[PDB]
Design a protein around this ligand. Structure first.
Ligand SMILES: CCCCCCCCCCCCCCCCCC(=O)OC[C@H](COP(=O)([O-])OCC(O)COP(=O)([O-])OC[C@@H](COC(=O)CCCCCCCCCCCCCCCCC)OC(=O)CCCCCCCCCCCCCCCCC)OC(=O)CCCCCCCCCCCCCCCCC
Ligand SMILES: CCCCCCCCCCCCCCCCCC(=O)OC[C@H](COP(=O)([O-])OCC(O)COP(=O)([O-])OC[C@@H](COC(=O)CCCCCCCCCCCCCCCCC)OC(=O)CCCCCCCCCCCCCCCCC)OC(=O)CCCCCCCCCCCCCCCCC
Ligand SMILES: CCCCCCCCCCCCCCCCCC(=O)OC[C@H](COP(=O)([O-])OCC(O)COP(=O)([O-])OC[C@@H](COC(=O)CCCCCCCCCCCCCCCCC)OC(=O)CCCCCCCCCCCCCCCCC)OC(=O)CCCCCCCCCCCCCCCCC
Ligand SMILES: CCCCCCCCCCCCCCCCCC(=O)OC[C@H](COP(=O)([O-])OCC(O)COP(=O)([O-])OC[C@@H](COC(=O)CCCCCCCCCCCCCCCCC)OC(=O)CCCCCCCCCCCCCCCCC)OC(=O)CCCCCCCCCCCCCCCCC
Lengths: 70, 135, 365, 29, 231, 124
């Protein structure tokens, strides 16, 4: 979770009501459509790019300390 | 007697209450088979044994009944494709972990990189020569 | 008295392989409700010899599980039948578990006993939590030197005729024909005198056994047939570094070949550090071998036995969620997602613990 | 298991020896 | 050992273990004279005599190459009957076969006699080979007896008769020398005798798990280059 | 508060699972560690460390939590001639001295009683 995801939820508050309260629990294709586009927290919502920077930032920074500490 | 006594006993053959809600494998293993593993023959025996328990070892019921595919493998290629797009480095890392346990020498690793990057460098020159032929 | 309780009976020769009942010693656990362990002793070997291992405070195995030291057919006090088919001998255990009201049990074995334990998991996997095999492998041992001696000794034992032979004639026969000290001692203690001292005989069926071994075909106990299949559950193998029965070079591959969940050396397969000694097969005699087996045994029962395949250890129960296959549930309005697999009580069928706790849950709400 | 190794070393997993001799010939008759 | 576990192994659409009248759509149906104009059928009532004449020909035409060997004629007769008694003793209900089992078997035996008339039936060639291998061994015994020498078969009979005396001379507590004891005495002599012979390896594996073939020569390498012929 | 049955173990040790066919092929390589939290568990480094100063320092800390322990600490750190707080008993010299100096002190108690009883009156 992050602030940008929380902003979407406030904007999608009425959309969440229509899809989750009404559609998601209906039977037939209308239910399959609501349960598929259900609104909430992200399944597998992690961002590998952001995680990649964090890893390379920490690995390259430890190299800076060795090279600079002479 | 004790053999039939327990077969008839409801307690001895009874699905748990939540058994219905559990995920159920709807195949005996005949849809996707391992053909070249050394336990190949042992795998078939477990398929044959599973098919027999379903029919009380009266396989005529299986011949008359409906045969179904492994619907659990549906859309498996699409799903792996999206996981590779979501995080290719993680998908590649874990799919190659057991292979990368055996790491070749520095020389071999360098030859791989050198020949691969050299092939890409020539591919780029051939792309450039095509722009020369178009001009 | 209390901790040691071995049901008493007389062997019965059976024409039908299904009317076979198993008999053995039961060791009660320290705590009230514990899962059960079924352990098979070496062929023609006494169950009592394993009592000090499972009843040692230093090891404290009974603190984990109740132990059934059970004899296979044609061995010890159990019924007698010429067939040694592991499928038939496995059904015998399932009837024993039914008569004793055991839903599922932990299986163990020593040497050929390990084969018997694994066969039950191969034929009845839904009711076996784990397998712990000691100095054994699911392999053809007909041509192993260790098996030949046992196969050879059993053939020599067929020459003695108790009716004519005197007690001294027997002792002289064993020392000369049986060189191994342990096998010799095992066979001597297997001799018993029936009521009214009518005559002495072996507790095990010498005739049915020799035919199985002497014939030296697929049904032989040294052999492991492809018919036995694959074991789907938890399996741990422990054998001496220098063992005549399981050679570390190639006799470890059958474990991967027969047991689907075996990870490999260092996780499910271990060797005990030891010297070359033909007596290392009997780990319970040497403290060094036993101390390692017990620690590894207690670790298998505590953390690995009866744990779902895709979970690492028992620690992951309730905190690791397994992925679900699509279109695997009957409910159509089901959002497929990860789940923690269900682990049930060890005797949930023959008790009402679920019915009882359901009531207590309602009282809360 | 279904993960036995590389294709080149596949014929290695077949041999099962009845003795403790090392090294072991790989070929399974 | 191993038994078929499928209980429906012998089930067919026509019934259990039915190999006489398999179920097919075009089933036999009756015919009515008053409504039948013409018919084309090959069935007849001549199979009984053709079964008789076929036996006489197969017997008389095979005896042409027995050279008056009475023991062979009698052995061949027993084998010829075993081929004609198949429909009389088979599980298959040969009387309920689809379109007449009598005509079917007769026509099948006729194809055999056709080969017998040319002396090309495998049973004929098998008979000549089996007999020649037998007479060569009986002549080897005859030549050894005429020379006063003792046959390998008599040396065992004499060596076994004495071994029985040694066993029953010490078996005084009991006096029932069963056929089982007599048998395992001979086998102990046959195994020892057979092992003495330089025979080709028959069993795949010897005392060790290794195969007993000329190809089971593994490392270590200790054989030098092959040497040539000596002058 | 609720404690349950002393005999029974946690339900985790009793709750079991069994395998069946088909089986998942995947072999787990590592344990999942999504969240880095290992609270309330002591370090396994504290495994085979020999006796040292931390033993008597932590003993006082726990002893000072009790009334009887506070007396032992004050007396030991003030009225014991020792060159170290790491007390190691390899002889019973100091123990026998304190016993002979005590069990002997209670001698003459009976002879003292005899004086009173016998000095009461003269038999004659
Ligand atoms: C009157 C005028 C009429 C005009 C209109 C006329 C139109 C007629 C319509 C009638 C035809 C449809 C009939 C109904 C079918 C019902 C059958 C059924 O029940 O479902 C079966 C089928 C079974 O799938 P499944 O059981 O769920 O699982 C699949 C397996 O697991 C397999 O999945 P997997 O994960 O294991 O991977 C394997 C998979 C995928 O394997 C692949 O790798 C193939 C990938 C193909 C797509 C990508 C191509 C590559 C190029 C693009 C790159 C994209 C990726 C790039 C990634 C990023 C790169 C950086 O293989 C497949 O191809 C699956 C296809 C489904 C099976 C059908 C048999 C196919 C055999 C022929 C194969 C060749 C054709 C391929 C067609 C594309 C299929 C997706 O489900 C369907 O797909 C149903 C499709 C029907 C949709 C109908 C929708 C409405 C149609 C009308 C709309 C308007 C159209 C207007 C057109 C105007 C004119 C042009
Ligand atoms: C086969 C041999 C030959 C191969 C030839 C080369 C193959 C293609 C190479 C492409 C490489 C480009 C790399 C891009 C940056 C990736 C950097 C990164 O950190 O990766 C993570 C990165 C995710 O990081 P993220 O941004 O934080 O997104 C996570 C969010 O949670 C996401 O939120 P969510 O979970 O809610 O979203 C659902 C998720 C799953 O849903 C899907 O992705 C499936 C459907 C996606 C549509 C199909 C993709 C079609 C291609 C995209 C459009 C054309 C190219 C766009 C430019 C891409 C280059 C940046 O979507 C994603 O995975 C991320 C979005 C996918 C892109 C869709 C939008 C495309 C337009 C981009 C607009 C922004 C750029 C401005 C325009 C730039 C052009 C001037 O992955 C990507 O974004 C896409 C990577 C695509 C790689 C595909 C092929 C990789 C493997 C190639 C193997 C090469 C052979 C050698 C292997 C040797 C092994 C032994
Ligand atoms: C979109 C573009 C499309 C076009 C391009 C498509 C390109 C597709 C390529 C995709 C990848 C290829 C498939 C690889 C499968 C995954 C890796 C793998 O194999 O698993 C590991 C497994 C064993 O490795 P390991 O388990 O790690 O054990 C090694 C120890 O850890 C430590 O090592 P050790 O002590 O046991 O032994 C020393 C070391 C020996 O040292 C080596 O590794 C030898 C490699 C030295 C570098 C070779 C140059 C780099 C090649 C790539 C660059 C291409 C240059 C441009 C080509 C221009 C002409 C097209 O052994 C190794 O480490 C592995 C060698 C086994 C052979 C590796 C597979 C063949 C090489 C890669 C093929 C490249 C094909 C690219 C183009 C194909 C176009 C049709 O390898 C095997 O699968 C066994 C297969 C049997 C291999 C022996 C017999 C092979 C005979 C055919 C040779 C074909 C040569 C092709 C030449 C290409 C044209 C010049
Ligand atoms: C006080 C005494 C001296 C102390 C010196 C201090 C030493 C400090 C060591 C520091 C260690 C650094 C650790 C971090 C690096 C570890 C990662 C790594 O890549 O190591 C390999 C590492 C280990 O490989 P390995 O399989 O275990 O083999 C280890 C040894 O190679 C062994 O393999 P072997 O057992 O099979 O032995 C066979 C050996 C057999 O070699 C021989 O028998 C003789 C070699 C004769 C060389 C003749 C050269 C002739 C040159 C002709 C050229 C003429 C053209 C000149 C052009 C002039 C233009 C006018 O051949 C080789 O092994 C080839 C290895 C290549 C070595 C290249 C460097 C050679 C000279 C280095 C001199 C350094 C001063 C040492 C002074 C000592 C004097 C006694 O490989 C990996 O698995 C990691 C991933 C590698 C991916 C490949 C790409 C890596 C490249 C980036 C690496 C990172 C940045 C650069 C680092 C420097 C790389 C060279």
């Amino acid at each position: 979770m992050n602030p940008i995801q929380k902003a979407w939820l406030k904007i999608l508050e009425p959309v969440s009501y229509v899809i989750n309260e009404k559609m998601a629990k209906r039977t037939g294709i209308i239910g399959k459509l609501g349960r598929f586009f259900a609104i909430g927290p992200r399944e597998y919502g992690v961002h590998p790019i952001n995680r990649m920077f964090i890893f390379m930032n920490r690995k390259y920074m430890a190299f800076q300390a060795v090279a600079l500490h002479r | 007697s004790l053999h039939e006594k327990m077969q008839t006993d409801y307690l001895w053959v009874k699905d748990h209450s939540q058994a219905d809600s559990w995920a159920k494998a709807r195949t005996h293993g005949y849809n996707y088979i391992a053909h070249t593993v050394p336990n190949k023959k042992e795998r078939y025996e477990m398929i044959w044994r599973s098919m027999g328990k379903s029919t009380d070892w009266e396989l005529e019921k299986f011949r008359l009944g409906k045969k179904f595919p492994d619907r659990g493998n549906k859309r498996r290629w699409f799903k792996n494709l999206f996981r590779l797009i979501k995080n290719p480095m993680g998908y590649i890392f874990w799919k190659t972990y057991k292979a990368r346990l055996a790491k070749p020498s520095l020389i071999v690793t360098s030859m791989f990189i050198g020949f691969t990057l050299g092939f890409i460098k020539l591919k780029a020159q051939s792309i450039a020569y095509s722009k020369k032929q178009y001009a | 008295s209390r901790i040691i309780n071995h049901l008493r009976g007389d062997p019965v020769y059976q024409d039908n392989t299904k009317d076979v009942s198993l008999r053995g010693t039961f060791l009660r656990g320290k705590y009230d409700d514990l899962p059960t362990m079924i352990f098979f002793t070496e062929a023609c070997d006494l169950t009592a010899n394993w009592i000090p291992f499972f009843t040692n405070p230093q090891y404290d195995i009974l603190a984990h599980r109740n132990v059934w030291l059970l004899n296979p057919r044609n061995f010890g006090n159990s019924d007698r039948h010429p067939s040694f088919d592991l499928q038939e001998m496995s059904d015998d255990v399932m009837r024993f578990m039914y008569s004793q009201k055991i839903s599922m049990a932990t299986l163990g074995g020593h040497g050929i006993g390990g084969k018997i334990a694994l066969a039950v998991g191969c034929y009845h996997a839904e009711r076996v939590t784990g397998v712990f095999s000691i100095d054994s492998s699911p392999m053809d041992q007909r041509y192993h030197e260790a098996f030949k001696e046992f196969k050879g000794y059993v053939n020599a034992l067929t020459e003695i005729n108790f009716k004519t032979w005197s007690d001294k004639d027997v002792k002289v026969f064993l020392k000369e024909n049986i060189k191994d000290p342990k096998w010799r001692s095992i066979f001597t203690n297997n001799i018993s005198k029936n009521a009214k001292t009518q005559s002495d005989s072996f507790n095990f069926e010498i005739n049915y056994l020799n035919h199985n071994l002497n014939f030296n075909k697929a049904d032989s106990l040294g052999n492991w047939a492809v018919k036995n299949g694959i074991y789907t559950g938890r399996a741990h193998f422990i054998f001496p570094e220098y063992s005549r029965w399981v050679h570390l070079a190639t006799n470890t591959l059958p474990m991967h070949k027969v047991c689907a969940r075996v990870k490999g050396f260092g996780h499910d397969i271990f060797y005990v550090q030891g010297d070359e000694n033909p007596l290392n097969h009997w780990v319970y005699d040497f403290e060094n071998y036993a101390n390692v087996v017990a620690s590894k045994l207690n670790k298998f029962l505590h953390s690995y036995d009866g744990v779902h395949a895709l979970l690492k250890d028992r620690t992951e129960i309730g905190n690791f969620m397994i992925p679900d296959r699509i279109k695997s549930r009957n409910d159509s309005k089901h959002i497929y997602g990860d789940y923690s697999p269900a682990h049930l009580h060890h005797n949930w069928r023959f008790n009402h613990i679920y019915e009882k706790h359901d009531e207590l849950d309602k009282k809360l709400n | 298991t279904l993960q036995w190794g590389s294709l080149a070393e596949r014929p290695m997993v077949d041999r099962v020896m009845s003795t403790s001799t090392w090294p072991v010939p790989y070929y399974q008759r | 050992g191993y038994k078929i576990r499928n209980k429906s192994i012998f089930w067919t659409r026509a019934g259990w273990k039915n190999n006489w009248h398999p179920k097919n759509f075009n089933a036999p149906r009756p015919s009515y004279g008053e409504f039948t104009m013409g018919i084309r059928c090959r069935n007849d009532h001549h199979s009984f005599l053709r079964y008789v004449q076929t036996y006489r020909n197969m017997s008389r035409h095979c005896k042409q190459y027995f050279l008056g060997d009475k023991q062979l004629e009698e052995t061949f007769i027993l084998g010829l009957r075993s081929l004609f008694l198949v429909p009389y003793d088979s599980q298959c209900l040969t009387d309920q076969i689809k379109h007449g089992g009598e005509r079917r078997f007769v026509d099948q035996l006729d194809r055999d006699f056709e080969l017998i008339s040319y002396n090309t039936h495998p049973y004929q060639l098998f008979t000549y080979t089996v007999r020649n291998e037998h007479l060569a061994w009986k002549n080897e015994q005859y030549e050894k007896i005429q020379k006063g020498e003792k046959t390998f078969e008599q040396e065992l009979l004499d060596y076994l008769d004495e071994q029985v005396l040694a066993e029953k001379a010490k078996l005084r507590d009991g006096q029932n020398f069963s056929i089982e004891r007599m048998t395992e005495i001979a086998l102990h002599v046959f195994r020892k005798a057979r092992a003495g012979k330089v025979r080709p390896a028959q069993d795949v594996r010897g005392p060790d798990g290794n195969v007993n073939d000329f190809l089971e020569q593994r490392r270590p390498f200790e054989h030098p280059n092959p040497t040539g012929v000596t002058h | 508060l609720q404690w349950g049955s002393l005999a029974e173990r946690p339900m985790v040790d009793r709750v079991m699972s069994t395998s069946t066919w088909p089986v998942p092929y995947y072999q787990r390589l590592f344990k999942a560690y999504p969240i880095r939290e290992k609270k309330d568990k002591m370090s396994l480094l504290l495994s085979d460390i020999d006796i040292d100063d931390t033993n008597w320092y932590q003993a006082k800390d726990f002893l000072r939590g009790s009334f009887r322990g506070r007396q032992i600490v004050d007396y030991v750190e003030n009225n014991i001639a020792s060159n170290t707080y790491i007390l190691i008993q390899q002889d019973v010299a100091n123990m026998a001295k304190a016993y002979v100096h005590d069990i002997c002190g209670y001698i003459d108690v009976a002879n003292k009683e005899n004086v009173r009883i016998l000095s009461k009156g003269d038999l004659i």
